[PDB]
Amino acid sequence: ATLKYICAECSSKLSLSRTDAVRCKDCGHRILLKARTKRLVQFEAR
Amino acid sequence: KVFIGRLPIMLRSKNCYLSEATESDLYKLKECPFDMGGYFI
Amino acid sequence: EEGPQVKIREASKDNVDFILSNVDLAMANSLRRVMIAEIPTLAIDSVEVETNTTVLADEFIAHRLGLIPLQSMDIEQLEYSRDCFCEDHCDKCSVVLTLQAFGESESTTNVYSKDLVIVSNLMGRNIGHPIIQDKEGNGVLICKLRKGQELKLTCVAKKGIAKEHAKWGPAAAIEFEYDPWNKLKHTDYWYEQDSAKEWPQSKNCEYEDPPNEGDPFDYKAQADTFYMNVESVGSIPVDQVVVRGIDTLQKKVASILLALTQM
Amino acid sequence: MIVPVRCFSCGKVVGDKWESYLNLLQEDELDEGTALSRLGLKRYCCRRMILTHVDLIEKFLRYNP
Ligand SMILES: [Zn+2]
Ligand SMILES: [Zn+2]
Ligand SMILES: [Zn+2]
């Protein structure tokens, strides 16, 4: 349902704007990963 | 009673929470069960 | 019934031992090389990745997928993408499969090549079908998923040949030999006391007459008779590799004759 | 990291045998040498493929996310 970030502990599709430092819901883990990409990548089977 | 500085800690000595951690606890801790760790972070 | 003749010693879904006689070492050799590298086969050559929470990277998985053998008996009628007039690929120059697997149970979910799902119209021709020779029927283990890991992919397999990439290899490994007794003298055995006692003997010896103590060297004898055995990965029937291989090499020489014509 | 699909040197598909193999060992208590031969792995190139493999994907899986 769209996101931009993700925590490395609860994997909650978070995502927030400025002035939100860094944190998750209950997971005060100040890490956050940048989800994935929508345009999908193609691969050479070789 | 009174605070004074911080002491980095050798990674697997008495303090380091890993000197006790079992195998299954290491994995959850995102630390490898094969790491020897005699170093500092 | 003419020049190159065959004598088959064994046969099966995967192996064929035979004896080629009345043929130059050359032809025997080329025919062999052709099999190893110039016979069309279908193989996953494109992989689009939707979701990968696996512990393997995308190109890692992809490399294996391209490696999974696929049916290829009717390839002689599937086309080379590079020759098809479509924009990219189509049911005329490809076969699209899909692999969707999700770590459901907490017992480690295994992904096999049998989870591949052909989604393009096979147009009634036998081609594209993960090949499986397993006892439990799981033709090659692609990957392993834990608790709740995903893996969504779409694979496009194309007509190819080993030369481009070993994956389009349908021949596994060929057994080659000739002159089991060193009669011809194409080798100088390295000994330490007794060559004849140090170097084992080939089962082909059994199929040929020994040299006889005092006979002078037959300087006029050349290489006749070759004891081969063609293995097969499955993508194509054993007996087929040999045939098509002979076909291909046959068509190749043909092309040179056409070339001199246009010239 | 997973059983190679296909042996490097000749290409005998060796990806569909990991499990079979590990089974001929455990329950059938066979020596590695006999197990291999029964999986049809006759040439050493093909043998070294399975014998030498280390299935790391197993400890790779053990990390939570
Ligand atoms: Zn969290
Ligand atoms: Zn096309
Ligand atoms: Zn091999």
From Swiss-Prot, chain A:
MF terms (GO), sorted A to Z: DNA binding; DNA-directed RNA polymerase activity; zinc ion binding
GO cellular-component term (any): peroxisome
Top-level taxon in the UniProt lineage: Eukaryota
Record note on modification: The N-terminus is blocked.
Any GO BP annotation: transcription initiation at RNA polymerase I promoter
Main location: nucleus
Localisation per UniProt entry: Nucleus, Nucleolus; Peroxisome
UniProt keyword list: DNA-directed RNA polymerase, Metal-binding, Nucleus, Peroxisome, Ribosome biogenesis, Transcription, Zinc, Zinc-finger
Note: Present with 907 molecules/cell in log phase SD medium.
Subunit structure: Component of the RNA polymerase I (Pol I), RNA polymerase II (Pol II) and RNA polymerase III (Pol III) complexes. Component of the RNA polymerase I (Pol I) complex consisting of 14 subunits: RPA135, RPA190, RPC40, RPA14, RPB5, RPO26, RPA43, RPB8, RPA12, RPB10, RPC19, RPC10, RPA49 and RPA34. The complex is composed of a horseshoe-shaped core containing ten subunits (RPA135, RPA190, RPB5, RPO26, RPB8, RPB10, RPC10, RPA12, RPC19 and RPC40) where RPA135 and RPA190 form the DNA-binding cleft.
Protein name: DNA-directed RNA polymerases I, II, and III subunit RPABC4
Source taxonomy: Eukaryota, Fungi, Dikarya, Ascomycota, Saccharomycotina
Part of the intact protein present: 25 to 70 of 70
UniProtKB/Swiss-Prot annotation, chain B:
Residues of the full protein shown: 164 to 204 of 1224
Compartmental location: Nucleus
Additional observations: The binding of ribonucleoside triphosphate to the RNA polymerase II transcribing complex probably involves a two-step mechanism. The initial binding seems to occur at the entry (E) site and involves a magnesium ion coordinated by three conserved aspartate residues of the two largest RNA Pol II subunits.
Function: DNA-dependent RNA polymerase catalyzes the transcription of DNA into RNA using the four ribonucleoside triphosphates as substrates. Second largest component of RNA polymerases II which synthesizes mRNA precursors and many functional non-coding RNAs. Proposed to contribute to the polymerase catalytic activity and forms the polymerase active center together with the largest subunit. Pol II is the central component of the basal RNA polymerase II transcription machinery.
This protein's name: DNA-directed RNA polymerase II subunit RPB2
Record-annotated membrane-spanning stretches: none
Assembly: Component of the RNA polymerase II (Pol II) complex consisting of 12 subunits.
Family under the similarity heading: Belongs to the RNA polymerase beta chain family.
Protein's gene: RPB2
Swiss-Prot record, chain C:
Coiled-coil spans in chain: none
CC per GO annotation: nucleoplasm; nucleus; RNA polymerase II, core complex
GO molecular function: DNA binding; DNA-directed RNA polymerase activity; metal ion binding; protein dimerization activity
Localization per Swiss-Prot or TrEMBL: Nucleus
GO biological process: RNA-templated transcription; termination of RNA polymerase II transcription; transcription by RNA polymerase II; transcription elongation by RNA polymerase II; transcription initiation at RNA polymerase II promoter
Main location: nucleus
Domain of life (superkingdom): Eukaryota
Keywords of the record: Acetylation, DNA-directed RNA polymerase, Metal-binding, Nucleus, Transcription, Zinc
Amino acids binding Zn(2+): 84, 86, 90, 93
Quaternary structure and partners: Component of the RNA polymerase II (Pol II) complex consisting of 12 subunits.
Stated role: DNA-dependent RNA polymerase catalyzes the transcription of DNA into RNA using the four ribonucleoside triphosphates as substrates. Component of RNA polymerase II which synthesizes mRNA precursors and many functional non-coding RNAs. Pol II is the central component of the basal RNA polymerase II transcription machinery. It is composed of mobile elements that move relative to each other. RPB3 is part of the core element with the central large cleft and the clamp element that moves to open and close the cleft. Seems to be involved in transcription termination.
Family: Belongs to the archaeal Rpo3/eukaryotic RPB3 RNA polymerase subunit family.
Gene field: RPB3
Full-protein interval shown: 3 to 265 of 318
From Swiss-Prot, chain D:
PANTHER family assigned: DNA-DIRECTED RNA POLYMERASES I, II, AND III SUBUNIT RPABC5, DNA-DIRECTED RNA POLYMERASES I, II, AND III SUBUNIT RPABC5 FAMILY MEMBER
UniProt keywords, alphabetically: DNA-directed RNA polymerase, Isopeptide bond, Metal-binding, Nucleus, Ribosome biogenesis, Transcription, Ubl conjugation, Zinc
Function, as annotated: DNA-dependent RNA polymerases catalyze the transcription of DNA into RNA using the four ribonucleoside triphosphates as substrates. Common component of RNA polymerases I, II and III which synthesize ribosomal RNA precursors, mRNA precursors and many functional non-coding RNAs, and a small RNAs, such as 5S rRNA and tRNAs, respectively. Pol II is the central component of the basal RNA polymerase II transcription machinery. Pols are composed of mobile elements that move relative to each other. In Pol II, RBP10 is part of the core element with the central large cleft.
Family classification: Belongs to the archaeal Rpo10/eukaryotic RPB10 RNA polymerase subunit family.
Binding site for Zn(2+): 7, 10, 45-46
Species of provenance: Saccharomyces cerevisiae (strain ATCC 204508 / S288c) (Baker's yeast)
Additional record remark: Present with 5300 molecules/cell in log phase SD medium.
Protein known as: DNA-directed RNA polymerases I, II, and III subunit RPABC5
Gene: RPB10
GO cellular component: nucleoplasm; nucleus; RNA polymerase I complex; RNA polymerase II, core complex; RNA polymerase III complex
Cellular localisation: Nucleus, Nucleolus
Taxonomy, superkingdom: Eukaryota
Transcription found in the keyword field: yes
